[PDB]
Amino acid sequence: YIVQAVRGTMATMSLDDIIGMHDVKQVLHEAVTLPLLVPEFFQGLRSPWKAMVLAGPPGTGKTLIARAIASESSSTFFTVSSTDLSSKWRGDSEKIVRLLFELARFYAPSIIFIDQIDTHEASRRVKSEFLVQMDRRVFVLAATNIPWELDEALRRRFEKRIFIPLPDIDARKKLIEKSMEGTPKSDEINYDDLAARTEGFSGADVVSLCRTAAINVLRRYDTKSLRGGELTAAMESLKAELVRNIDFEAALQAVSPSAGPDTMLKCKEWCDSFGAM
Amino acid sequence: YIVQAVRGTMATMSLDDIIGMHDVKQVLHEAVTLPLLVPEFFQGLRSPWKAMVLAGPPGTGKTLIARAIASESSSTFFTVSSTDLSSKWRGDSEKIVRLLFELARFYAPSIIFIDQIDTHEASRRVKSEFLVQMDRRVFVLAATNIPWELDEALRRRFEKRIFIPLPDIDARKKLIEKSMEGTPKSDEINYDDLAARTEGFSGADVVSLCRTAAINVLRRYDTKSLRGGELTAAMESLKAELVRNIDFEAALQAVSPSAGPDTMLKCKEWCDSFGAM
Amino acid sequence: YIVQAVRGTMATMSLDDIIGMHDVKQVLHEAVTLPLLVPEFFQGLRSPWKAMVLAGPPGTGKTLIARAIASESSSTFFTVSSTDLSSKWRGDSEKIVRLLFELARFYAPSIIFIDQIDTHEASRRVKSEFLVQMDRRVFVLAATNIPWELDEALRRRFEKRIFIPLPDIDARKKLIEKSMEGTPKSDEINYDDLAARTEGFSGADVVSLCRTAAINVLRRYDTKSLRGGELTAAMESLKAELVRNIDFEAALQAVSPSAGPDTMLKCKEWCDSFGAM
Amino acid sequence: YIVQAVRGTMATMSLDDIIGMHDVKQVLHEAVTLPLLVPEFFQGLRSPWKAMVLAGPPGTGKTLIARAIASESSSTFFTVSSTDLSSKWRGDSEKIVRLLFELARFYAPSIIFIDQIDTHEASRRVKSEFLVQMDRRVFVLAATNIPWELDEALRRRFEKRIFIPLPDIDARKKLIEKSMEGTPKSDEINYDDLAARTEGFSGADVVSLCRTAAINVLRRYDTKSLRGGELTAAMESLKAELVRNIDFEAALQAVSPSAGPDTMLKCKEWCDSFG
Amino acid sequence: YIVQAVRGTMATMSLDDIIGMHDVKQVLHEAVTLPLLVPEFFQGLRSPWKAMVLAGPPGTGKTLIARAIASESSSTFFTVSSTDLSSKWRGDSEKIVRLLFELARFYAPSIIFIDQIDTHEASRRVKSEFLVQMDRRVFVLAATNIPWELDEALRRRFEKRIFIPLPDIDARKKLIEKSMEGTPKSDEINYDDLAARTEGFSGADVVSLCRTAAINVLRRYDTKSLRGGELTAAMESLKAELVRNIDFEAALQAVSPSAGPDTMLKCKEWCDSFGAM
Amino acid sequence: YIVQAVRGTMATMSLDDIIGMHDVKQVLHEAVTLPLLVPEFFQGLRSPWKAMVLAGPPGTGKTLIARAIASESSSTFFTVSSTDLSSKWRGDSEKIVRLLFELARFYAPSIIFIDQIDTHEASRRVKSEFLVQMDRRVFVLAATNIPWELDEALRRRFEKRIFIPLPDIDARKKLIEKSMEGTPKSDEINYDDLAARTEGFSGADVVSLCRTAAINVLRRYDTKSLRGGELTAAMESLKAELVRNIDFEAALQAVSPSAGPDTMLKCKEWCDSFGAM
Ligand SMILES: Nc1ncnc2c1ncn2[C@@H]1O[C@H](COP(=O)(O)OP(=O)(O)OP(=O)(O)O)[C@@H](O)[C@H]1O
Ligand SMILES: Nc1ncnc2c1ncn2[C@@H]1O[C@H](COP(=O)(O)OP(=O)(O)OP(=O)(O)O)[C@@H](O)[C@H]1O
Ligand SMILES: Nc1ncnc2c1ncn2[C@@H]1O[C@H](COP(=O)(O)OP(=O)(O)OP(=O)(O)O)[C@@H](O)[C@H]1O
Ligand SMILES: Nc1ncnc2c1ncn2[C@@H]1O[C@H](COP(=O)(O)OP(=O)(O)OP(=O)(O)O)[C@@H](O)[C@H]1O
Ligand SMILES: Nc1ncnc2c1ncn2[C@@H]1O[C@H](COP(=O)(O)OP(=O)(O)OP(=O)(O)O)[C@@H](O)[C@H]1O
Ligand SMILES: Nc1ncnc2c1ncn2[C@@H]1O[C@H](COP(=O)(O)OP(=O)(O)OP(=O)(O)O)[C@@H](O)[C@H]1O
């Protein structure tokens, strides 16, 4: 009928470029891959974990994961938003969900990513029709930044409910030394002195900090001026140009985490009580 | 015509697997089978229950028992969705129901199951036509987690409407020990001492916790290890390796109820106040 | 053309089984049959009443009564839901009614039952043509339970708009005994306190109570027990086995009205506040 | 072609029995027959106001008066409804109006009625061609009760848009003098003091009220009892049996207007704004 | 369909018209033109800024930026309204945004600006679909006045978030010295003498002051001074009359800055606390 | 679609019947007429004023001015209220405004005025959509009576911010004598003695005061004359009866100021303290 909508929701890099969540990495090595490697085991009690949800503050790798996942996974895969939207010319959308899970089972090995799960009448409609399709190997995944409002009952229907940290600091050492790979830099840098000042940041802040130094070395030069509009031989040779501890110093004094803490504190309070594994 | 959707409503497990609800167990011993055995008793006054509904939080088998009914009864069966919609091209979905019940009685002495009783003006169309054909035996059963939201007189036209709570402590042990079928294990396993630590759980909590107790066996070993991912002698000992007190324990500390009791006490108060048997 | 459904709305029990509402049974004894027996009286001013509407909480046989009314008399009758839809192919369904009233004045002094008239452009279409088409001796009967939303003018065009309350302990005694029609019982009964504990209920509620009390004797016997799937001489003795107050009391504690009261207060305000006779 | 509905619109009481608004009665005793008798007055400016507009609450005779004019007039009529519809077989209903007013001019000078023109591409088709056909002595009426949703501008397109209040207690008493015609009735009945309790009513309210006072006469007799179904002495005497203040009393206590005054008050402002 | 408003937002001055804030233009010279002239530098780790965001009270010429930018810029521009309107006929405006970014990648490495970013459920719809779509060199721009109420996460997604200062005073010298162009003035002026009094103004407040002193020349004469209703030669010679400290002083006493400093002080307290660069 | 609200807002005294703020009379002769009689002078820096605001107790001519404005203004006019009314059908009203300014620019040079701009989500909706539309000759205005709470952004975007005071005593003399326009009077009257005693009275206060004495002339004569619908000779000679101090007196002690000058004085502190010219 009008299923070209879901045709746009289709696709077909690496998987261990990520630094953190050895447990989630484990469970997604377990209930996703090994069934497709060992269908004999996973069944009934042995069956794979059907679905989970990922709860964390922004920039904590939630959205970052699925591109790696589906870029590694041989399975079919879909990406979804809250834009399975409605229209009076359609009068309904929940049939799109029947087509969705029926097509997923049609491409039986298939996995989902969806974001902004928080999303009156049609909310209850789609929320309802989601379920009998929610309950041939399949996996489903969630995401959020304010899961205090799983509206009613998906606290069950996604088996595991996971929190992730605003990450710790040796991890940030791995993030930064990994982030400046294939990039010029003076080897004088000490990532402990850097790391100690990284308190409260997250992944996006960190890689944005590497971007901030990479632009800062340009800022030290004839930056707002011109080469006559050209690329000077030194400008072209900026690939050879290096980076130093000062170049991050200016950024650190310049940059805040650009985010609070009490959200992480609250949802951290909820991940234990009324928060599953 | 477009009524092919109703053909999908029909389909082709045991009943005594379920614990608790001796009430409803009895009611389907009463108004389902005994009529087939004893049509003479059931008549007029004594004719069977026309319908009911159910109430409870998720995790209580409301979406489960009916599959055991279908595996039990030789009668017909009718899955139901909220996706009985139409379009600006169609603009008429009440006839779906006028054909539903006529098809039912025409095809068999039939049984209906339904969920998401959320069911603008079209809602009043469907709700309007529902009442007439709601009043040669036929039974209906329904369940929800939105009991307060019954917008109209179906509190009456379901002659019974029942809440079910979370179980007592020992019945949880019976749920586990039932789920210990098809489960290798040791015998140092005090189901009751566990049951003390099962506080505020439901069925899916228990069974999911047992799945955790199983996979934890693997999680004690190196997941990302490989012998080419081959079926190593311990990986052949998957069926041999057991689930012991620790294997539960990590689940016990890794798990929440993943639920809130507020709605539970709410509807469990409504089940006595404006709620019947 | 496609109006064979107009014949599907058609047909051609007993009356005084129903108790109370001497008001209304007087209205129809007056204004329906006696015209057929004595047209000479009725003319112009003294012509019969052309239509009414009803108001009541559910469980009071508004939707039920007209079955036995039409079964009593011999004049024509029309069963009418809100099934008056159309299609993008049709897109014109008010013609249903223009054909309808013509077919009604065609046959005979005609009688319309119609339920849930709480009833978008097509809404104003049908609701418009219905008016002029509402004005040979034809009569109408409406019914609903949320008439607070009588849209505009059907308030007028139905001369009398009637409220019916919940019953009272005398009439309740009569109804209770009208549930005991050809019903066994023991003689330890006093309907005084029994009926006194019925406050909050309706007719159908009491029906569900007594119907529950008959099966309650099975619920005293070993319903978990089996006859080998056969008959039991006690199962045949159920016609012999009487009913008792003990076979009621458990049902009494086990049951609420399963309904509200503030709606009764609301329409019982509108029963006179802008409330026709 | 498919014009069975066209000729189906055709059709073939008193006038002073109507009690209220001698203004429009003046407008039409002017603008109905003197068009037939004095076209020199009715030409150019002082020609009949070729269309008008109306709106009021229910029970004021808007829907009733056109029948009175039908039995009064001699010209031709076209009953009209919201049944300018069609199906995907046709998919084009505006040809209806094209053949229609052609038929109107073809047959005779004529007068049209419709109630509740509250009445989607086909809507734009209707309001498109209907205006083209909206303008050799042909004349119009439409009416409604909700000019809050008066479609586009038609108080512009129509000379007059009249409000018709819940009428005055006096002429209501005159409507009581219309009600009791053909009735055995005492003369101890103060129709005006009774009219005092009426306030908050339309005409039809008074009609059904006095009718319920009429049936009350029967209701004083044993209803569920039988004379063998016979027209009893007293039952035959219903044609002789009085109607009295007691018979009005049950009507007075029993009846409400069946609906409020908010719509009447709301649209009462519309005859000023876009008036 | 019904989304021609997108084209309406499209459209087709100088760039040193703006005075000060070397940081701001540095971000854009770095991030906009030089990528177009030097793509091979700006890429991957060195990729241009995906999007920034801004702050400060109005009258600081934030909105005044974009007419200059798209007056200069090569790639196209996309205006934005908070009127991402909708209807019950539509019921969904998020499709406007998929169409928006789709147009963005479709047309060119082009530019967007939104104002009043502060702008229930539909707000979560748009604030949901916006996000993943905000992740081919492309740039987006932001602005507000209450950055304290940047809702949930976009503090992250717009890396550079700047609290501009209030207008500093040497820059005010540049402001007036710019705004005294096409302005016949006396050379008595000490712009610093004015500047001692300007503490509290925006830039627009000061250009408005220049307006005020300009009209003041006329206001020396009567507005009821007529030439038969004509232009006097001196009315065109108001340019021949020079602007003077007399002409300012009335404006200088006359103006209050019409704005409190505690707002800029407050969000200045914010720009140091979770305030990006 | 629903654009009638704007076109309906269009509608159709003299501009020298006013007594108060010779200043504002000048300024609004300057921003309005002379840009039509001398458009050449108004350009760039010299361009006309966009808008301003007003501030005082109500019934102080802020609404009565505008009818002399329009009655004199050769250009066209728009009426405005706070009626940006919402509807679940429409749900997006503020497109009214984007259509509005597009209309005004599309029609001709013109005027806009709203009273009580002091008008949750919809506040920031109308406020947000206002701004860019507020930034082909045009003049615009608003006015309230509690501008102390006016938004800071608005505090700029309306150029001037003006306070109208209650009438001062010589103006009070000119305002009685203006209110005496179209009235015979006696000679014992001393309007200076009245101006000495008429504190608190706004414009409407003095108007309805002089009127209250004009009808005091009736209150002395046979006001209770029930002459069968006839006019008494003195009652006919009321307008002929020369008004006197005896006539003013009972109007003085009848009428009161009944207006809040305290808060008006507080915002009159604000009208210079963070309140512009
Ligand atoms: N555990 C991690 N290991 C390595 N990198 C990480 C990790 N978490 C975050 N990052 C880095 O931080 C960035 C976060 O991007 P992204 O916006 O997807 O985070 P997010 O929290 O998933 O965003 P959203 O809140 O939209 O889901 C990535 O580019 C990634 O390189
Ligand atoms: N009494 C029980 N006996 C055995 N298993 C149970 C019982 N209650 C729940 N379960 C298990 O928990 C799960 C409950 O699923 P189900 O959706 O039927 O519960 P529910 O209460 O219907 O949830 P919802 O009504 O919210 O959909 C099933 O997988 C079932 O195996
Ligand atoms: N006055 C009465 N006398 C005898 N039985 C009654 C009476 N009122 C209700 N009942 C019983 O209760 C049931 C009510 O059915 P029904 O749905 O018609 O009630 P209702 O109140 O008319 O419903 P609705 O709200 O749709 O009008 C009937 O089956 C009938 O036997
Ligand atoms: N002026 C009047 N003179 C005589 N009878 C009247 C008058 N007004 C109303 N009636 C009575 O009231 C009844 C109402 O008729 P009608 O339906 O035309 O009113 P209406 O205002 O058109 O109602 P609606 O507009 O809702 O159709 C008639 O049967 C008539 O006897
Ligand atoms: N840096 C600057 N250089 C030159 N002129 C300026 C500067 N900042 C402000 N102005 C002047 O102030 C005026 C303010 O314009 P504008 O209305 O766009 O304010 P804004 O701060 O952009 O408002 P908003 O907060 O809604 O974006 C400009 O027209 C300009 O004349
Ligand atoms: N400056 C003035 N010159 C002449 N008359 C005035 C002046 N100010 C007020 N008045 C008189 O006072 C009365 C009040 O006018 P108006 O209703 O416009 O005041 P307002 O404050 O705008 O009213 P509101 O704001 O309550 O609608 C008018 O009758 C007007 O003639």
Side-chain angles (χ1 to χ4, degrees), chain F residues 241-261 267:
Chain F
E241 173 55 27
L242 298 176
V243 179
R244 287 178 292 170
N245 288 315
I246 191 169
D247 302 331
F248 285 108
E249 186 65 26
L252 295 171
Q253 58 183 353
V255 179
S256 297
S258 179
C267 69

mmCIF file of all heavy atoms in Angstrom, chain F residues 241-267, unseen atoms left out:
data_model
loop_
_atom_site.group_PDB
_atom_site.id
_atom_site.type_symbol
_atom_site.label_atom_id
_atom_site.label_comp_id
_atom_site.label_asym_id
_atom_site.label_seq_id
_atom_site.Cartn_x
_atom_site.Cartn_y
_atom_site.Cartn_z
ATOM 1 N N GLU F 241 -31.693 73.149 30.077
ATOM 2 C CA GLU F 241 -31.318 73.609 31.408
ATOM 3 C C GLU F 241 -29.812 73.809 31.475
ATOM 4 O O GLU F 241 -29.042 72.852 31.339
ATOM 5 C CB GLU F 241 -31.784 72.624 32.481
ATOM 6 C CG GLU F 241 -31.281 72.937 33.897
ATOM 7 C CD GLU F 241 -31.623 74.336 34.363
ATOM 8 O OE1 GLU F 241 -32.632 74.897 33.875
ATOM 9 O OE2 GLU F 241 -30.893 74.875 35.215
ATOM 10 N N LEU F 242 -29.400 75.052 31.690
ATOM 11 C CA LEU F 242 -27.986 75.376 31.795
ATOM 12 C C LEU F 242 -27.392 74.673 33.009
ATOM 13 O O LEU F 242 -27.869 74.851 34.135
ATOM 14 C CB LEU F 242 -27.807 76.887 31.899
ATOM 15 C CG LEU F 242 -28.301 77.692 30.693
ATOM 16 C CD1 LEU F 242 -28.155 79.179 30.960
ATOM 17 C CD2 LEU F 242 -27.573 77.295 29.415
ATOM 18 N N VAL F 243 -26.364 73.855 32.772
ATOM 19 C CA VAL F 243 -25.733 73.113 33.853
ATOM 20 C C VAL F 243 -25.141 74.095 34.862
ATOM 21 O O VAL F 243 -24.700 75.197 34.510
ATOM 22 C CB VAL F 243 -24.663 72.157 33.298
ATOM 23 C CG1 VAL F 243 -23.976 71.394 34.424
ATOM 24 C CG2 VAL F 243 -25.286 71.180 32.305
ATOM 25 N N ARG F 244 -25.137 73.689 36.131
ATOM 26 C CA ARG F 244 -24.766 74.554 37.241
ATOM 27 C C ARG F 244 -23.899 73.789 38.231
ATOM 28 O O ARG F 244 -23.725 72.572 38.137
ATOM 29 C CB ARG F 244 -26.010 75.098 37.947
ATOM 30 C CG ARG F 244 -26.765 76.150 37.176
ATOM 31 C CD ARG F 244 -28.003 76.584 37.930
ATOM 32 N NE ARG F 244 -29.006 75.520 37.997
ATOM 33 C CZ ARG F 244 -30.096 75.556 38.762
ATOM 34 N NH1 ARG F 244 -30.346 76.595 39.554
ATOM 35 N NH2 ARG F 244 -30.942 74.536 38.744
ATOM 36 N N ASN F 245 -23.342 74.533 39.190
ATOM 37 C CA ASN F 245 -22.598 73.915 40.282
ATOM 38 C C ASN F 245 -23.476 72.964 41.083
ATOM 39 O O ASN F 245 -23.014 71.910 41.534
ATOM 40 C CB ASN F 245 -22.019 74.998 41.189
ATOM 41 C CG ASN F 245 -20.870 75.734 40.545
ATOM 42 O OD1 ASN F 245 -19.987 75.119 39.946
ATOM 43 N ND2 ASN F 245 -20.882 77.059 40.645
ATOM 44 N N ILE F 246 -24.747 73.325 41.277
ATOM 45 C CA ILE F 246 -25.691 72.426 41.936
ATOM 46 C C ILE F 246 -25.841 71.135 41.148
ATOM 47 O O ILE F 246 -26.129 70.077 41.719
ATOM 48 C CB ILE F 246 -27.052 73.126 42.128
ATOM 49 C CG1 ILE F 246 -27.951 72.304 43.050
ATOM 50 C CG2 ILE F 246 -27.742 73.342 40.795
ATOM 51 C CD1 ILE F 246 -29.195 73.041 43.484
ATOM 52 N N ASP F 247 -25.654 71.197 39.828
ATOM 53 C CA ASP F 247 -25.745 70.006 38.995
ATOM 54 C C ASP F 247 -24.456 69.198 39.050
ATOM 55 O O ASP F 247 -24.494 67.963 39.088
ATOM 56 C CB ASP F 247 -26.050 70.410 37.555
ATOM 57 C CG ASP F 247 -27.331 71.194 37.435
ATOM 58 O OD1 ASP F 247 -28.225 70.976 38.271
ATOM 59 O OD2 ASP F 247 -27.442 72.035 36.517
ATOM 60 N N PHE F 248 -23.308 69.879 39.042
ATOM 61 C CA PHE F 248 -22.036 69.179 39.166
ATOM 62 C C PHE F 248 -21.907 68.478 40.510
ATOM 63 O O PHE F 248 -21.289 67.415 40.597
ATOM 64 C CB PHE F 248 -20.867 70.144 38.983
ATOM 65 C CG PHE F 248 -20.624 70.551 37.560
ATOM 66 C CD1 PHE F 248 -20.930 71.827 37.121
ATOM 67 C CD2 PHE F 248 -20.041 69.665 36.669
ATOM 68 C CE1 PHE F 248 -20.686 72.195 35.819
ATOM 69 C CE2 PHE F 248 -19.802 70.033 35.362
ATOM 70 C CZ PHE F 248 -20.122 71.301 34.938
ATOM 71 N N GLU F 249 -22.483 69.061 41.566
ATOM 72 C CA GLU F 249 -22.174 68.643 42.931
ATOM 73 C C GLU F 249 -22.530 67.180 43.165
ATOM 74 O O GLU F 249 -21.673 66.366 43.540
ATOM 75 C CB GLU F 249 -22.922 69.548 43.910
ATOM 76 C CG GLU F 249 -22.596 69.330 45.375
ATOM 77 C CD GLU F 249 -21.161 69.679 45.709
ATOM 78 O OE1 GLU F 249 -20.572 70.522 45.001
ATOM 79 O OE2 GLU F 249 -20.620 69.106 46.677
ATOM 80 N N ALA F 250 -23.793 66.820 42.932
ATOM 81 C CA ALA F 250 -24.216 65.444 43.149
ATOM 82 C C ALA F 250 -23.515 64.477 42.207
ATOM 83 O O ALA F 250 -23.479 63.278 42.492
ATOM 84 C CB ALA F 250 -25.730 65.312 42.988
ATOM 85 N N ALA F 251 -22.959 64.966 41.095
ATOM 86 C CA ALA F 251 -22.136 64.122 40.238
ATOM 87 C C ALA F 251 -20.757 63.904 40.844
ATOM 88 O O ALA F 251 -20.198 62.806 40.746
ATOM 89 C CB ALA F 251 -22.012 64.745 38.849
ATOM 90 N N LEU F 252 -20.195 64.945 41.460
ATOM 91 C CA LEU F 252 -18.930 64.815 42.171
ATOM 92 C C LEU F 252 -19.044 63.775 43.272
ATOM 93 O O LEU F 252 -18.292 62.795 43.305
ATOM 94 C CB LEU F 252 -18.518 66.163 42.763
ATOM 95 C CG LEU F 252 -18.184 67.301 41.802
ATOM 96 C CD1 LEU F 252 -18.020 68.595 42.578
ATOM 97 C CD2 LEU F 252 -16.929 66.987 41.014
ATOM 98 N N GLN F 253 -19.987 63.977 44.191
ATOM 99 C CA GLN F 253 -20.140 63.019 45.279
ATOM 100 C C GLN F 253 -20.812 61.722 44.843
ATOM 101 O O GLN F 253 -20.805 60.759 45.617
ATOM 102 C CB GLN F 253 -20.903 63.663 46.440
ATOM 103 C CG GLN F 253 -22.279 64.195 46.108
ATOM 104 C CD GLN F 253 -22.925 64.881 47.293
ATOM 105 O OE1 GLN F 253 -22.399 64.848 48.406
ATOM 106 N NE2 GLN F 253 -24.047 65.542 47.052
ATOM 107 N N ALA F 254 -21.380 61.663 43.635
ATOM 108 C CA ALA F 254 -21.813 60.385 43.077
ATOM 109 C C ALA F 254 -20.626 59.596 42.537
ATOM 110 O O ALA F 254 -20.336 58.488 42.998
ATOM 111 C CB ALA F 254 -22.845 60.602 41.967
ATOM 112 N N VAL F 255 -19.928 60.161 41.560
ATOM 113 C CA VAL F 255 -18.835 59.465 40.892
ATOM 114 C C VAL F 255 -17.613 59.467 41.797
ATOM 115 O O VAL F 255 -17.390 60.412 42.565
ATOM 116 C CB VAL F 255 -18.532 60.123 39.534
ATOM 117 C CG1 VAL F 255 -17.371 59.418 38.837
ATOM 118 C CG2 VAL F 255 -19.782 60.140 38.662
ATOM 119 N N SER F 256 -16.827 58.401 41.719
ATOM 120 C CA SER F 256 -15.548 58.278 42.396
ATOM 121 C C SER F 256 -14.461 57.987 41.369
ATOM 122 O O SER F 256 -14.762 57.607 40.231
ATOM 123 C CB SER F 256 -15.587 57.154 43.440
ATOM 124 O OG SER F 256 -16.525 57.448 44.460
ATOM 125 N N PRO F 257 -13.184 58.171 41.722
ATOM 126 C CA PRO F 257 -12.127 57.755 40.782
ATOM 127 C C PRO F 257 -12.154 56.264 40.499
ATOM 128 O O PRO F 257 -12.239 55.856 39.334
ATOM 129 C CB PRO F 257 -10.833 58.192 41.492
ATOM 130 C CG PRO F 257 -11.246 59.261 42.420
ATOM 131 C CD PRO F 257 -12.623 58.886 42.882
ATOM 132 N N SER F 258 -12.107 55.436 41.546
ATOM 133 C CA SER F 258 -12.190 53.982 41.415
ATOM 134 C C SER F 258 -11.096 53.441 40.498
ATOM 135 O O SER F 258 -11.328 52.536 39.692
ATOM 136 C CB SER F 258 -13.572 53.557 40.918
ATOM 137 O OG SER F 258 -13.647 52.150 40.772
ATOM 138 N N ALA F 259 -9.892 54.001 40.622
ATOM 139 C CA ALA F 259 -8.762 53.625 39.785
ATOM 140 C C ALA F 259 -7.507 53.549 40.640
ATOM 141 O O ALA F 259 -7.354 54.293 41.613
ATOM 142 C CB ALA F 259 -8.556 54.621 38.637
ATOM 143 N N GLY F 260 -6.606 52.646 40.259
ATOM 144 C CA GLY F 260 -5.386 52.427 41.010
ATOM 145 C C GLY F 260 -4.227 53.261 40.510
ATOM 146 O O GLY F 260 -3.563 52.901 39.533
ATOM 147 N N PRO F 261 -3.972 54.380 41.185
ATOM 148 C CA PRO F 261 -2.845 55.243 40.865
ATOM 149 C C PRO F 261 -1.559 54.831 41.568
ATOM 150 O O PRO F 261 -0.487 55.314 41.193
ATOM 151 C CB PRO F 261 -3.177 56.693 41.229
ATOM 152 N N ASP F 262 -1.637 53.962 42.578
ATOM 153 C CA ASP F 262 -0.438 53.535 43.293
ATOM 154 C C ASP F 262 0.449 52.672 42.403
ATOM 155 O O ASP F 262 1.614 53.003 42.155
ATOM 156 C CB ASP F 262 -0.834 52.781 44.563
ATOM 157 N N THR F 263 -0.089 51.549 41.922
ATOM 158 C CA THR F 263 0.666 50.694 41.011
ATOM 159 C C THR F 263 1.032 51.445 39.739
ATOM 160 O O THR F 263 2.120 51.249 39.182
ATOM 161 C CB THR F 263 -0.145 49.442 40.680
ATOM 162 N N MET F 264 0.133 52.311 39.268
ATOM 163 C CA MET F 264 0.448 53.159 38.127
ATOM 164 C C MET F 264 1.659 54.034 38.413
ATOM 165 O O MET F 264 2.468 54.290 37.515
ATOM 166 C CB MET F 264 -0.762 54.018 37.765
ATOM 167 N N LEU F 265 1.808 54.486 39.661
ATOM 168 C CA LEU F 265 2.980 55.266 40.033
ATOM 169 C C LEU F 265 4.219 54.388 40.145
ATOM 170 O O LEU F 265 5.329 54.847 39.857
ATOM 171 C CB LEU F 265 2.727 55.997 41.350
ATOM 172 N N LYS F 266 4.052 53.133 40.566
ATOM 173 C CA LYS F 266 5.186 52.217 40.628
ATOM 174 C C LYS F 266 5.751 51.958 39.237
ATOM 175 O O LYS F 266 6.956 52.117 39.000
ATOM 176 C CB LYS F 266 4.766 50.907 41.293
ATOM 177 N N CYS F 267 4.894 51.567 38.293
ATOM 178 C CA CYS F 267 5.366 51.407 36.928
ATOM 179 C C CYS F 267 5.802 52.737 36.331
ATOM 180 O O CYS F 267 6.645 52.753 35.429
ATOM 181 C CB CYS F 267 4.287 50.763 36.060
ATOM 182 S SG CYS F 267 2.855 51.803 35.754
#
